[PDB]
Amino acid sequence: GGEGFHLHGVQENSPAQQAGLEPYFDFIITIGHSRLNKENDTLKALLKANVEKPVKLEVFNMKTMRVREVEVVPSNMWGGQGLLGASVRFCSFRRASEHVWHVLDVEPSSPAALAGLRPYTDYIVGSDQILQESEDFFTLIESHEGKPLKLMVYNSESDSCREVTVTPNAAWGGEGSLGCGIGYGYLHRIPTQPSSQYK
Ligand SMILES: [Cl-]
Ligand SMILES: [Zn+2]
């Protein structure tokens, strides 16, 4: 299960952002006594019912696996698109688990190397382009041949996210347009064990 409005993006200065809702890692599973365990308009409607008013959400986090309660004020005042200001998709917790791309070896002077992608510790988790192609990460790379592309990246060392901009270049001198390995599935998901640097 299987049941949440998964965050795929959060707008700058949004109510979502101000309440600490985080892209990829967070699911909105409940708004005011209503459990969002079905693909319907309840979240959208209850956000609207509480416009300019504080309402509490129950939020599930992929990394922590805990539910936390968060307070949000949906609003038409903050300047961006939407009352919440987050891009949301109804996703299973399992699907989200699998939609992560582990950076493997990085070729010394590759576009990936120029972009600062870190071998084995960087994990690609999103892109702020949910326009009309934000499907596969590989699909995304092929369409930005010769074009800068903004990635959301998680790093297992810092245990935090950052925005990476990379220009895929099929003519860079190696094979691929990225010039790094990408790992998927078994042994390539977000680590559950903390990294060696304690803390
Ligand atoms: Cl997902
Ligand atoms: Zn999702």
mmCIF file with all atom_site columns, C-alpha atoms and ligand atoms in Angstrom:
data_model
loop_
_atom_site.group_PDB
_atom_site.id
_atom_site.type_symbol
_atom_site.label_atom_id
_atom_site.label_alt_id
_atom_site.label_comp_id
_atom_site.label_asym_id
_atom_site.label_entity_id
_atom_site.label_seq_id
_atom_site.pdbx_PDB_ins_code
_atom_site.Cartn_x
_atom_site.Cartn_y
_atom_site.Cartn_z
_atom_site.occupancy
_atom_site.B_iso_or_equiv
_atom_site.pdbx_formal_charge
_atom_site.auth_seq_id
_atom_site.auth_comp_id
_atom_site.auth_asym_id
_atom_site.auth_atom_id
_atom_site.pdbx_PDB_model_num
ATOM   1   C  CA . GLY A 1 1   ? 0.000   0.000  0.000   1.00 0.00 ? 1   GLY A CA 1
ATOM   2   C  CA . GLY A 1 2   ? -0.428  1.926  -1.971  1.00 0.00 ? 2   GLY A CA 1
ATOM   3   C  CA . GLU A 1 3   ? -2.201  4.910  -0.516  1.00 0.00 ? 3   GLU A CA 1
ATOM   4   C  CA . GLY A 1 4   ? -0.920  8.445  -0.581  1.00 0.00 ? 4   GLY A CA 1
ATOM   5   C  CA . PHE A 1 5   ? -0.693  11.641 -2.479  1.00 0.00 ? 5   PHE A CA 1
ATOM   6   C  CA . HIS A 1 6   ? 3.035   11.505 -3.163  1.00 0.00 ? 6   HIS A CA 1
ATOM   7   C  CA . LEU A 1 7   ? 4.941   14.768 -3.546  1.00 0.00 ? 7   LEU A CA 1
ATOM   8   C  CA . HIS A 1 8   ? 6.773   14.978 -6.890  1.00 0.00 ? 8   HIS A CA 1
ATOM   9   C  CA . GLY A 1 9   ? 7.668   18.664 -6.498  1.00 0.00 ? 9   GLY A CA 1
ATOM   10  C  CA . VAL A 1 10  ? 7.434   21.656 -4.192  1.00 0.00 ? 10  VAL A CA 1
ATOM   11  C  CA . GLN A 1 11  ? 7.350   25.261 -5.356  1.00 0.00 ? 11  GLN A CA 1
ATOM   12  C  CA . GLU A 1 12  ? 9.569   27.964 -3.961  1.00 0.00 ? 12  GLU A CA 1
ATOM   13  C  CA . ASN A 1 13  ? 7.891   29.870 -1.092  1.00 0.00 ? 13  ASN A CA 1
ATOM   14  C  CA . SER A 1 14  ? 4.803   27.632 -1.269  1.00 0.00 ? 14  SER A CA 1
ATOM   15  C  CA . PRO A 1 15  ? 2.661   26.718 1.755   1.00 0.00 ? 15  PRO A CA 1
ATOM   16  C  CA . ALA A 1 16  ? 3.928   23.177 1.187   1.00 0.00 ? 16  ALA A CA 1
ATOM   17  C  CA . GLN A 1 17  ? 7.526   24.374 1.392   1.00 0.00 ? 17  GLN A CA 1
ATOM   18  C  CA . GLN A 1 18  ? 6.911   26.533 4.437   1.00 0.00 ? 18  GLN A CA 1
ATOM   19  C  CA . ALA A 1 19  ? 5.383   23.594 6.322   1.00 0.00 ? 19  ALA A CA 1
ATOM   20  C  CA . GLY A 1 20  ? 8.358   21.330 5.587   1.00 0.00 ? 20  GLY A CA 1
ATOM   21  C  CA . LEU A 1 21  ? 6.717   19.104 2.980   1.00 0.00 ? 21  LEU A CA 1
ATOM   22  C  CA . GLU A 1 22  ? 9.555   17.503 1.027   1.00 0.00 ? 22  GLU A CA 1
ATOM   23  C  CA . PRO A 1 23  ? 9.584   16.277 -2.579  1.00 0.00 ? 23  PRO A CA 1
ATOM   24  C  CA . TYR A 1 24  ? 9.829   12.514 -3.149  1.00 0.00 ? 24  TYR A CA 1
ATOM   25  C  CA . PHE A 1 25  ? 10.283  11.546 0.485   1.00 0.00 ? 25  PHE A CA 1
ATOM   26  C  CA . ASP A 1 26  ? 6.854   12.749 1.722   1.00 0.00 ? 26  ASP A CA 1
ATOM   27  C  CA . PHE A 1 27  ? 3.304   11.449 1.177   1.00 0.00 ? 27  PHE A CA 1
ATOM   28  C  CA . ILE A 1 28  ? 0.187   13.345 2.224   1.00 0.00 ? 28  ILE A CA 1
ATOM   29  C  CA . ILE A 1 29  ? -1.917  10.519 3.597   1.00 0.00 ? 29  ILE A CA 1
ATOM   30  C  CA . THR A 1 30  ? -4.509  12.435 5.655   1.00 0.00 ? 30  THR A CA 1
ATOM   31  C  CA . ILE A 1 31  ? -6.111  15.894 5.713   1.00 0.00 ? 31  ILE A CA 1
ATOM   32  C  CA . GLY A 1 32  ? -8.468  16.750 8.623   1.00 0.00 ? 32  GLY A CA 1
ATOM   33  C  CA . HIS A 1 33  ? -9.942  13.381 9.661   1.00 0.00 ? 33  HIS A CA 1
ATOM   34  C  CA . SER A 1 34  ? -10.076 12.284 6.015   1.00 0.00 ? 34  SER A CA 1
ATOM   35  C  CA . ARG A 1 35  ? -7.761  9.425  5.034   1.00 0.00 ? 35  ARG A CA 1
ATOM   36  C  CA . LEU A 1 36  ? -6.482  9.777  1.478   1.00 0.00 ? 36  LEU A CA 1
ATOM   37  C  CA . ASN A 1 37  ? -6.300  6.117  0.595   1.00 0.00 ? 37  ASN A CA 1
ATOM   38  C  CA . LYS A 1 38  ? -8.112  6.342  -2.755  1.00 0.00 ? 38  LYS A CA 1
ATOM   39  C  CA . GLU A 1 39  ? -7.596  8.086  -6.110  1.00 0.00 ? 39  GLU A CA 1
ATOM   40  C  CA . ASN A 1 40  ? -10.215 10.845 -5.851  1.00 0.00 ? 40  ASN A CA 1
ATOM   41  C  CA . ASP A 1 41  ? -10.620 14.622 -5.466  1.00 0.00 ? 41  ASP A CA 1
ATOM   42  C  CA . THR A 1 42  ? -10.818 14.707 -1.642  1.00 0.00 ? 42  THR A CA 1
ATOM   43  C  CA . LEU A 1 43  ? -7.361  16.302 -1.089  1.00 0.00 ? 43  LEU A CA 1
ATOM   44  C  CA . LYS A 1 44  ? -7.996  18.934 -3.769  1.00 0.00 ? 44  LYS A CA 1
ATOM   45  C  CA . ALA A 1 45  ? -11.438 19.684 -2.378  1.00 0.00 ? 45  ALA A CA 1
ATOM   46  C  CA . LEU A 1 46  ? -10.417 19.873 1.287   1.00 0.00 ? 46  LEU A CA 1
ATOM   47  C  CA . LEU A 1 47  ? -7.479  22.090 0.445   1.00 0.00 ? 47  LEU A CA 1
ATOM   48  C  CA . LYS A 1 48  ? -10.005 24.415 -1.179  1.00 0.00 ? 48  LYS A CA 1
ATOM   49  C  CA . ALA A 1 49  ? -12.420 24.157 1.732   1.00 0.00 ? 49  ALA A CA 1
ATOM   50  C  CA . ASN A 1 50  ? -9.605  25.385 3.985   1.00 0.00 ? 50  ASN A CA 1
ATOM   51  C  CA . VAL A 1 51  ? -8.204  28.140 1.756   1.00 0.00 ? 51  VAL A CA 1
ATOM   52  C  CA . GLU A 1 52  ? -6.424  30.778 3.876   1.00 0.00 ? 52  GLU A CA 1
ATOM   53  C  CA . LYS A 1 53  ? -7.023  28.609 6.965   1.00 0.00 ? 53  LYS A CA 1
ATOM   54  C  CA . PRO A 1 54  ? -4.694  26.269 8.873   1.00 0.00 ? 54  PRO A CA 1
ATOM   55  C  CA . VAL A 1 55  ? -5.474  22.616 8.404   1.00 0.00 ? 55  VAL A CA 1
ATOM   56  C  CA . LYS A 1 56  ? -3.488  19.651 9.680   1.00 0.00 ? 56  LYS A CA 1
ATOM   57  C  CA . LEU A 1 57  ? -2.042  16.936 7.438   1.00 0.00 ? 57  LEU A CA 1
ATOM   58  C  CA . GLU A 1 58  ? -0.743  13.508 8.336   1.00 0.00 ? 58  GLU A CA 1
ATOM   59  C  CA . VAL A 1 59  ? 2.437   12.947 6.354   1.00 0.00 ? 59  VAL A CA 1
ATOM   60  C  CA . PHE A 1 60  ? 4.352   9.746  5.733   1.00 0.00 ? 60  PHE A CA 1
ATOM   61  C  CA . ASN A 1 61  ? 8.085   9.901  5.015   1.00 0.00 ? 61  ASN A CA 1
ATOM   62  C  CA . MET A 1 62  ? 9.924   7.324  2.889   1.00 0.00 ? 62  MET A CA 1
ATOM   63  C  CA . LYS A 1 63  ? 13.269  7.588  4.690   1.00 0.00 ? 63  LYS A CA 1
ATOM   64  C  CA . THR A 1 64  ? 11.941  7.677  8.262   1.00 0.00 ? 64  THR A CA 1
ATOM   65  C  CA . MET A 1 65  ? 8.855   5.556  7.580   1.00 0.00 ? 65  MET A CA 1
ATOM   66  C  CA . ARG A 1 66  ? 7.097   7.627  10.233  1.00 0.00 ? 66  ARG A CA 1
ATOM   67  C  CA . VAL A 1 67  ? 3.853   9.552  10.090  1.00 0.00 ? 67  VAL A CA 1
ATOM   68  C  CA . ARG A 1 68  ? 4.157   13.124 11.346  1.00 0.00 ? 68  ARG A CA 1
ATOM   69  C  CA . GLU A 1 69  ? 1.426   15.726 11.656  1.00 0.00 ? 69  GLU A CA 1
ATOM   70  C  CA . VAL A 1 70  ? 2.003   19.000 9.830   1.00 0.00 ? 70  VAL A CA 1
ATOM   71  C  CA . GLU A 1 71  ? 0.090   22.256 9.690   1.00 0.00 ? 71  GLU A CA 1
ATOM   72  C  CA . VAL A 1 72  ? -0.553  23.907 6.335   1.00 0.00 ? 72  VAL A CA 1
ATOM   73  C  CA . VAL A 1 73  ? -2.384  27.038 5.185   1.00 0.00 ? 73  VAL A CA 1
ATOM   74  C  CA . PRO A 1 74  ? -3.636  26.563 1.608   1.00 0.00 ? 74  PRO A CA 1
ATOM   75  C  CA . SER A 1 75  ? -3.598  29.969 -0.014  1.00 0.00 ? 75  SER A CA 1
ATOM   76  C  CA . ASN A 1 76  ? -4.038  32.040 -3.180  1.00 0.00 ? 76  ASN A CA 1
ATOM   77  C  CA . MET A 1 77  ? -1.626  34.677 -1.834  1.00 0.00 ? 77  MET A CA 1
ATOM   78  C  CA . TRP A 1 78  ? 1.858   33.194 -2.111  1.00 0.00 ? 78  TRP A CA 1
ATOM   79  C  CA . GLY A 1 79  ? 2.243   33.859 -5.838  1.00 0.00 ? 79  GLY A CA 1
ATOM   80  C  CA . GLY A 1 80  ? 2.807   30.459 -7.454  1.00 0.00 ? 80  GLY A CA 1
ATOM   81  C  CA . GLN A 1 81  ? 0.462   27.833 -8.879  1.00 0.00 ? 81  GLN A CA 1
ATOM   82  C  CA . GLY A 1 82  ? -2.014  26.011 -6.638  1.00 0.00 ? 82  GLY A CA 1
ATOM   83  C  CA . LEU A 1 83  ? -3.181  26.455 -3.048  1.00 0.00 ? 83  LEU A CA 1
ATOM   84  C  CA . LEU A 1 84  ? -0.565  24.096 -1.662  1.00 0.00 ? 84  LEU A CA 1
ATOM   85  C  CA . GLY A 1 85  ? 2.117   24.701 -4.277  1.00 0.00 ? 85  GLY A CA 1
ATOM   86  C  CA . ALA A 1 86  ? 3.199   21.102 -4.606  1.00 0.00 ? 86  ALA A CA 1
ATOM   87  C  CA . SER A 1 87  ? 3.032   18.709 -7.493  1.00 0.00 ? 87  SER A CA 1
ATOM   88  C  CA . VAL A 1 88  ? 1.254   15.598 -6.258  1.00 0.00 ? 88  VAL A CA 1
ATOM   89  C  CA . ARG A 1 89  ? 0.599   12.072 -7.594  1.00 0.00 ? 89  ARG A CA 1
ATOM   90  C  CA . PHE A 1 90  ? -1.394  9.191  -6.135  1.00 0.00 ? 90  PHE A CA 1
ATOM   91  C  CA . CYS A 1 91  ? 1.319   6.567  -5.698  1.00 0.00 ? 91  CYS A CA 1
ATOM   92  C  CA . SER A 1 92  ? 1.975   3.351  -3.860  1.00 0.00 ? 92  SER A CA 1
ATOM   93  C  CA . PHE A 1 93  ? 4.751   3.477  -1.313  1.00 0.00 ? 93  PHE A CA 1
ATOM   94  C  CA . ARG A 1 94  ? 6.405   0.656  -3.300  1.00 0.00 ? 94  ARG A CA 1
ATOM   95  C  CA . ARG A 1 95  ? 6.356   2.522  -6.640  1.00 0.00 ? 95  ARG A CA 1
ATOM   96  C  CA . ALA A 1 96  ? 8.049   5.523  -5.032  1.00 0.00 ? 96  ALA A CA 1
ATOM   97  C  CA . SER A 1 97  ? 10.675  3.148  -3.547  1.00 0.00 ? 97  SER A CA 1
ATOM   98  C  CA . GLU A 1 98  ? 11.612  1.999  -6.992  1.00 0.00 ? 98  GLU A CA 1
ATOM   99  C  CA . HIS A 1 99  ? 11.708  5.354  -8.752  1.00 0.00 ? 99  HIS A CA 1
ATOM   100 C  CA . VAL A 1 100 ? 15.274  6.195  -7.735  1.00 0.00 ? 100 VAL A CA 1
ATOM   101 C  CA . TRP A 1 101 ? 18.448  6.130  -9.846  1.00 0.00 ? 101 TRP A CA 1
ATOM   102 C  CA . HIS A 1 102 ? 21.754  5.291  -8.160  1.00 0.00 ? 102 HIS A CA 1
ATOM   103 C  CA . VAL A 1 103 ? 24.845  7.030  -9.573  1.00 0.00 ? 103 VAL A CA 1
ATOM   104 C  CA . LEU A 1 104 ? 27.515  4.407  -10.176 1.00 0.00 ? 104 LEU A CA 1
ATOM   105 C  CA . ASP A 1 105 ? 30.949  4.926  -11.683 1.00 0.00 ? 105 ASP A CA 1
ATOM   106 C  CA . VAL A 1 106 ? 31.562  8.378  -13.141 1.00 0.00 ? 106 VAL A CA 1
ATOM   107 C  CA . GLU A 1 107 ? 33.834  8.809  -16.168 1.00 0.00 ? 107 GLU A CA 1
ATOM   108 C  CA . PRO A 1 108 ? 36.591  11.368 -15.387 1.00 0.00 ? 108 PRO A CA 1
ATOM   109 C  CA . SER A 1 109 ? 35.587  14.182 -17.737 1.00 0.00 ? 109 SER A CA 1
ATOM   110 C  CA . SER A 1 110 ? 32.009  13.183 -18.511 1.00 0.00 ? 110 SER A CA 1
ATOM   111 C  CA . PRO A 1 111 ? 28.985  15.499 -18.489 1.00 0.00 ? 111 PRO A CA 1
ATOM   112 C  CA . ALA A 1 112 ? 28.113  13.734 -15.236 1.00 0.00 ? 112 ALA A CA 1
ATOM   113 C  CA . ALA A 1 113 ? 31.592  14.567 -13.872 1.00 0.00 ? 113 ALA A CA 1
ATOM   114 C  CA . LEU A 1 114 ? 31.195  18.200 -14.960 1.00 0.00 ? 114 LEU A CA 1
ATOM   115 C  CA . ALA A 1 115 ? 27.771  18.329 -13.248 1.00 0.00 ? 115 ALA A CA 1
ATOM   116 C  CA . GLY A 1 116 ? 29.274  17.156 -9.951  1.00 0.00 ? 116 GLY A CA 1
ATOM   117 C  CA . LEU A 1 117 ? 27.465  13.824 -9.678  1.00 0.00 ? 117 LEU A CA 1
ATOM   118 C  CA . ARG A 1 118 ? 29.070  11.749 -6.926  1.00 0.00 ? 118 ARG A CA 1
ATOM   119 C  CA . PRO A 1 119 ? 29.866  8.062  -7.619  1.00 0.00 ? 119 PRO A CA 1
ATOM   120 C  CA . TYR A 1 120 ? 27.887  5.583  -5.453  1.00 0.00 ? 120 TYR A CA 1
ATOM   121 C  CA . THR A 1 121 ? 26.594  8.174  -2.967  1.00 0.00 ? 121 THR A CA 1
ATOM   122 C  CA . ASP A 1 122 ? 24.354  10.296 -5.227  1.00 0.00 ? 122 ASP A CA 1
ATOM   123 C  CA . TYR A 1 123 ? 20.818  9.035  -5.924  1.00 0.00 ? 123 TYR A CA 1
ATOM   124 C  CA . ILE A 1 124 ? 18.609  10.769 -8.460  1.00 0.00 ? 124 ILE A CA 1
ATOM   125 C  CA . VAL A 1 125 ? 15.096  11.106 -7.140  1.00 0.00 ? 125 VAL A CA 1
ATOM   126 C  CA . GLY A 1 126 ? 13.417  13.772 -9.220  1.00 0.00 ? 126 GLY A CA 1
ATOM   127 C  CA . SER A 1 127 ? 13.345  16.561 -11.783 1.00 0.00 ? 127 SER A CA 1
ATOM   128 C  CA . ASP A 1 128 ? 11.520  19.883 -11.529 1.00 0.00 ? 128 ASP A CA 1
ATOM   129 C  CA . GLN A 1 129 ? 10.154  19.247 -15.009 1.00 0.00 ? 129 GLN A CA 1
ATOM   130 C  CA . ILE A 1 130 ? 6.899   17.330 -14.626 1.00 0.00 ? 130 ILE A CA 1
ATOM   131 C  CA . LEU A 1 131 ? 5.642   18.998 -17.818 1.00 0.00 ? 131 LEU A CA 1
ATOM   132 C  CA . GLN A 1 132 ? 4.711   16.176 -20.222 1.00 0.00 ? 132 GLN A CA 1
ATOM   133 C  CA . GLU A 1 133 ? 7.596   13.692 -20.239 1.00 0.00 ? 133 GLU A CA 1
ATOM   134 C  CA . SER A 1 134 ? 8.756   13.329 -16.617 1.00 0.00 ? 134 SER A CA 1
ATOM   135 C  CA . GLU A 1 135 ? 8.478   9.531  -16.851 1.00 0.00 ? 135 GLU A CA 1
ATOM   136 C  CA . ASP A 1 136 ? 11.636  7.432  -16.999 1.00 0.00 ? 136 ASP A CA 1
ATOM   137 C  CA . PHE A 1 137 ? 14.920  9.069  -16.010 1.00 0.00 ? 137 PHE A CA 1
ATOM   138 C  CA . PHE A 1 138 ? 16.444  7.624  -19.171 1.00 0.00 ? 138 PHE A CA 1
ATOM   139 C  CA . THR A 1 139 ? 13.632  9.089  -21.272 1.00 0.00 ? 139 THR A CA 1
ATOM   140 C  CA . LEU A 1 140 ? 14.385  12.444 -19.613 1.00 0.00 ? 140 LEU A CA 1
ATOM   141 C  CA . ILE A 1 141 ? 18.082  12.251 -20.470 1.00 0.00 ? 141 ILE A CA 1
ATOM   142 C  CA . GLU A 1 142 ? 17.454  11.459 -24.156 1.00 0.00 ? 142 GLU A CA 1
ATOM   143 C  CA . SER A 1 143 ? 15.239  14.525 -24.592 1.00 0.00 ? 143 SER A CA 1
ATOM   144 C  CA . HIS A 1 144 ? 17.805  16.901 -23.069 1.00 0.00 ? 144 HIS A CA 1
ATOM   145 C  CA . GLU A 1 145 ? 20.631  15.948 -25.404 1.00 0.00 ? 145 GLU A CA 1
ATOM   146 C  CA . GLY A 1 146 ? 22.572  19.209 -25.733 1.00 0.00 ? 146 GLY A CA 1
ATOM   147 C  CA . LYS A 1 147 ? 20.171  20.860 -23.236 1.00 0.00 ? 147 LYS A CA 1
ATOM   148 C  CA . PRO A 1 148 ? 20.788  21.668 -19.530 1.00 0.00 ? 148 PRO A CA 1
ATOM   149 C  CA . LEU A 1 149 ? 18.609  19.584 -17.187 1.00 0.00 ? 149 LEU A CA 1
ATOM   150 C  CA . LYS A 1 150 ? 17.770  20.128 -13.494 1.00 0.00 ? 150 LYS A CA 1
ATOM   151 C  CA . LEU A 1 151 ? 17.824  17.051 -11.280 1.00 0.00 ? 151 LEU A CA 1
ATOM   152 C  CA . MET A 1 152 ? 16.816  16.539 -7.665  1.00 0.00 ? 152 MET A CA 1
ATOM   153 C  CA . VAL A 1 153 ? 19.594  14.482 -6.087  1.00 0.00 ? 153 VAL A CA 1
ATOM   154 C  CA . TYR A 1 154 ? 19.850  12.707 -2.730  1.00 0.00 ? 154 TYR A CA 1
ATOM   155 C  CA . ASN A 1 155 ? 23.238  11.978 -1.230  1.00 0.00 ? 155 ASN A CA 1
ATOM   156 C  CA . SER A 1 156 ? 23.744  9.191  1.296   1.00 0.00 ? 156 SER A CA 1
ATOM   157 C  CA . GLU A 1 157 ? 26.682  10.957 2.982   1.00 0.00 ? 157 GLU A CA 1
ATOM   158 C  CA . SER A 1 158 ? 25.036  14.295 3.760   1.00 0.00 ? 158 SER A CA 1
ATOM   159 C  CA . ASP A 1 159 ? 21.674  12.505 3.940   1.00 0.00 ? 159 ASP A CA 1
ATOM   160 C  CA . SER A 1 160 ? 20.142  15.486 2.129   1.00 0.00 ? 160 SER A CA 1
ATOM   161 C  CA . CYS A 1 161 ? 19.050  16.725 -1.262  1.00 0.00 ? 161 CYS A CA 1
ATOM   162 C  CA . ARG A 1 162 ? 20.324  19.307 -3.712  1.00 0.00 ? 162 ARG A CA 1
ATOM   163 C  CA . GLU A 1 163 ? 19.611  20.492 -7.267  1.00 0.00 ? 163 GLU A CA 1
ATOM   164 C  CA . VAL A 1 164 ? 22.075  19.364 -9.911  1.00 0.00 ? 164 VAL A CA 1
ATOM   165 C  CA . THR A 1 165 ? 22.224  20.824 -13.427 1.00 0.00 ? 165 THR A CA 1
ATOM   166 C  CA . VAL A 1 166 ? 23.687  18.615 -16.134 1.00 0.00 ? 166 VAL A CA 1
ATOM   167 C  CA . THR A 1 167 ? 24.058  18.994 -19.889 1.00 0.00 ? 167 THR A CA 1
ATOM   168 C  CA . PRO A 1 168 ? 23.895  15.588 -21.600 1.00 0.00 ? 168 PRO A CA 1
ATOM   169 C  CA . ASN A 1 169 ? 26.345  15.512 -24.521 1.00 0.00 ? 169 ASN A CA 1
ATOM   170 C  CA . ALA A 1 170 ? 26.249  12.468 -26.823 1.00 0.00 ? 170 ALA A CA 1
ATOM   171 C  CA . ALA A 1 171 ? 29.436  13.766 -28.464 1.00 0.00 ? 171 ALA A CA 1
ATOM   172 C  CA . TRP A 1 172 ? 31.454  14.142 -25.287 1.00 0.00 ? 172 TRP A CA 1
ATOM   173 C  CA . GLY A 1 173 ? 34.014  11.492 -26.247 1.00 0.00 ? 173 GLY A CA 1
ATOM   174 C  CA . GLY A 1 174 ? 32.794  8.488  -24.280 1.00 0.00 ? 174 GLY A CA 1
ATOM   175 C  CA . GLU A 1 175 ? 29.673  6.426  -24.816 1.00 0.00 ? 175 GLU A CA 1
ATOM   176 C  CA . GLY A 1 176 ? 26.310  7.571  -23.486 1.00 0.00 ? 176 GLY A CA 1
ATOM   177 C  CA . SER A 1 177 ? 25.436  11.225 -23.175 1.00 0.00 ? 177 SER A CA 1
ATOM   178 C  CA . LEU A 1 178 ? 25.873  11.244 -19.404 1.00 0.00 ? 178 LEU A CA 1
ATOM   179 C  CA . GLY A 1 179 ? 29.106  9.285  -18.976 1.00 0.00 ? 179 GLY A CA 1
ATOM   180 C  CA . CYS A 1 180 ? 28.202  7.622  -15.682 1.00 0.00 ? 180 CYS A CA 1
ATOM   181 C  CA . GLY A 1 181 ? 26.719  4.306  -14.611 1.00 0.00 ? 181 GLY A CA 1
ATOM   182 C  CA . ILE A 1 182 ? 23.173  4.288  -13.233 1.00 0.00 ? 182 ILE A CA 1
ATOM   183 C  CA . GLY A 1 183 ? 21.937  1.552  -10.888 1.00 0.00 ? 183 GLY A CA 1
ATOM   184 C  CA . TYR A 1 184 ? 18.385  0.317  -10.366 1.00 0.00 ? 184 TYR A CA 1
ATOM   185 C  CA . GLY A 1 185 ? 16.744  -2.187 -7.972  1.00 0.00 ? 185 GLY A CA 1
ATOM   186 C  CA . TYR A 1 186 ? 18.407  -4.563 -5.476  1.00 0.00 ? 186 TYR A CA 1
ATOM   187 C  CA . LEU A 1 187 ? 21.282  -2.822 -3.632  1.00 0.00 ? 187 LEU A CA 1
ATOM   188 C  CA . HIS A 1 188 ? 20.515  0.435  -5.478  1.00 0.00 ? 188 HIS A CA 1
ATOM   189 C  CA . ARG A 1 189 ? 17.744  1.950  -3.393  1.00 0.00 ? 189 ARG A CA 1
ATOM   190 C  CA . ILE A 1 190 ? 18.065  4.674  -0.754  1.00 0.00 ? 190 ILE A CA 1
ATOM   191 C  CA . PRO A 1 191 ? 20.261  3.126  1.976   1.00 0.00 ? 191 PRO A CA 1
ATOM   192 C  CA . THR A 1 192 ? 18.537  2.173  5.237   1.00 0.00 ? 192 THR A CA 1
ATOM   193 C  CA . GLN A 1 193 ? 21.784  1.907  7.211   1.00 0.00 ? 193 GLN A CA 1
ATOM   194 C  CA . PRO A 1 194 ? 23.333  5.315  8.031   1.00 0.00 ? 194 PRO A CA 1
ATOM   195 C  CA . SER A 1 195 ? 26.624  6.104  6.253   1.00 0.00 ? 195 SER A CA 1
ATOM   196 C  CA . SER A 1 196 ? 29.980  5.573  7.969   1.00 0.00 ? 196 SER A CA 1
ATOM   197 C  CA . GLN A 1 197 ? 30.366  9.178  9.223   1.00 0.00 ? 197 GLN A CA 1
ATOM   198 C  CA . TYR A 1 198 ? 28.755  9.412  12.645  1.00 0.00 ? 198 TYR A CA 1
ATOM   199 C  CA . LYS A 1 199 ? 26.794  11.417 13.793  1.00 0.00 ? 199 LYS A CA 1
HETATM 200 CL CL . CL  B 2 .   ? 6.741   7.542  -7.645  1.00 0.00 ? 1   CL  B CL 1
HETATM 201 ZN ZN . ZN  B 3 .   ? 5.091   9.143  -6.876  1.00 0.00 ? 2   ZN  B ZN 1
#
